Ligand binder design. Structure first.
Ligand SMILES: *C(=O)c1ccc(-c2ccc(C(=O)OCC)cn2)nc1
Ligand SMILES: *NNC(=O)c1ccc(-c2ccc(C(N)=O)cn2)nc1
Ligand SMILES: Cc1cccc(C)c1
Ligand SMILES: Cc1cccc(C)c1
Ligand SMILES: Cc1cccc(C)c1
Ligand SMILES: Cc1cccc(C)c1
Ligand SMILES: Cc1cccc(C)c1
Length: 9
């Protein structure tokens, strides 16, 4: 889940 968001950065 964290990675799914972190792609934004
Ligand atoms: C949420 O974005 C997210 C994405 C990917 C993963 C995840 C956990 C573990 C592996 C892995 O290769 O584990 C080897 C033990 C890959 N991806 N978790 C949360
Ligand atoms: N928000 N994330 C990024 O902007 C981001 C872009 C690219 C990469 C990345 C990581 C690792 C490789 C590699 N070839 O091992 C390439 N690009 N990370 C984050
Ligand atoms: C951070 C990241 C790695 C692999 C695939 C996705 C969608 C995101
Ligand atoms: C982010 C990442 C690196 C290496 C291997 C996996 C499955 C995921
Ligand atoms: C915004 C964010 C949360 C967790 C992990 C990373 C790399 C970024
Ligand atoms: C407020 C906000 C928007 C997009 C992405 C993040 C990590 C935060
Ligand atoms: C270019 C940029 C916008 C927002 C957040 C970061 C870390 C960089």
């Amino acid at each position: 889940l964290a990675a799914a968001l972190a792609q934004a950065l």
